[PDB]
Design a protein around this ligand. Structure first.
Ligand SMILES: NC(=O)c1ccc[n+]([C@@H]2O[C@H](COP(=O)([O-])OP(=O)(O)OC[C@H]3O[C@@H](n4cnc5c(N)ncnc54)[C@H](OP(=O)(O)O)[C@@H]3O)[C@@H](O)[C@H]2O)c1
Ligand SMILES: Nc1nc(=O)c2nc(CNc3ccc(C(=O)N[C@@H](CCC(=O)O)C(=O)O)cc3)cnc2[nH]1
Length: 159
C-alpha cells in the first residue's frame, strides 16, 4: 500500500515560502518514526526544503529534470516513482502540494498532524473526502517548551 504523511495547520495549510510556518520537533519525531526504513517519495521543492537525504530510508525525488545529488534516486514520473521502490509493504509519500495532489487517489492510509494554529500559507493539502476514510487513531498533545502549539496525530484508513 501507499500512505500520505502530512502535518496540516488550520485550513489544510501545509506551507509558505518553501517552508513550514511552525516548528514542532515532536511532529518530526513522529514523522521519522512513521517513515524510518521505508521508501519516501517527495518532489523537487519538498526535497529542496529538507536539504539532505533522510537516513534509514530510500529517498526518491520527482523532477521532470535531471537529478543533482547522487545520494538520492531521481524520477520523472509517478510510475517511475512507484517503480523505484520495488516490492515493499508500505511506501511513504511525503508531499509537497502537487505530489500529494497526485498520490491521494492511490493512497490507502493517512498519517496526519492537526496542528492548532491559524497561519497563512500558499500550499494546501488535497481535499480528501470524509466519507471515504476511517479515522482509526488519535493522540493529543499540548504546546510545550519545544512545541509552540498543540496538535493531534490521527490515522485514517480508506474506507
Ligand atoms: N506539512 C507537511 O506535512 C509538508 C510535507 C511536504 C511538504 N510540505 C511543504 O509544501 C511546499 C512544497 O510543496 P509544492 O507542492 O510546492 O511542491 P513539491 O511537490 O514538493 O515540488 C514539486 C516539484 O515536483 C516535481 N514533480 C512533481 N510531480 C512531478 C511529476 N509527475 N513528474 C515530474 N516532476 C514532478 C516538479 O519538478 P521540477 O521542479 O523538476 O520541474 C515540481 O516542480 C513547502 O512549503 C513544503 O515545506 C509540507
Ligand atoms: N507529520 C509530518 N510532519 C512534517 O513536518 C512533515 N514534513 C515533511 C517534509 N519536510 C521535512 C523536513 C524535515 C524532516 C526532517 O528533518 N526529518 C528528520 C527529523 C529531525 C531533524 O530535522 O533533525 C528525520 O530524520 O526524519 C522531514 C521532512 C513531510 N511529511 C511531514 N509529515
Amino acid at each position: 500500500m501507499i500512505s500520505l504523511i502530512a502535518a496540516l495547520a488550520v485550513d489544510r495549510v501545509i506551507g509558505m515560502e518553501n517552508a513550514m510556518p511552525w516548528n514542532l520537533p515532536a511532529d518530526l519525531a513522529w514523522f521519522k518514526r512513521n517513515t524510518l526504513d521505508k521508501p519516501v517519495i517527495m518532489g523537487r521543492h519538498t526535497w529542496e526544503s529538507i536539504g539532505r537525504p533522510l537516513p534509514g530510508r530510500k529517498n526518491i525525488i520527482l523532477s521532470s529534470q535531471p537529478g543533482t545529488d547522487d545520494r538520492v534516486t531521481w524520477v520523472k514520473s509517478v510510475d517511475e516513482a512507484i517503480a523505484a521502490c520495488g516490492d515493499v509493504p508500505e511506501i511513504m509519500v511525503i508531499g509537497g502540494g502537487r505530489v500529494y495532489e497526485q498520490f491521494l487517489p492511490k493512497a490507502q492510509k493517512l498519517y496526519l498532524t492537526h496542528i492548532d494554529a491559524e497561519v497563512e500559507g500558499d500550499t494546501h493539502f488535497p481535499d480528501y473526502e470524509p466519507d471515504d476514510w476511517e479515522s482509526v487513531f488519535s493522540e493529543f498533545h499540548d504546546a510545550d517548551a519545544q512545541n509552540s502549539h498543540s496538535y493531534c496525530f490521527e490515522i485514517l484508513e480508506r474506507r
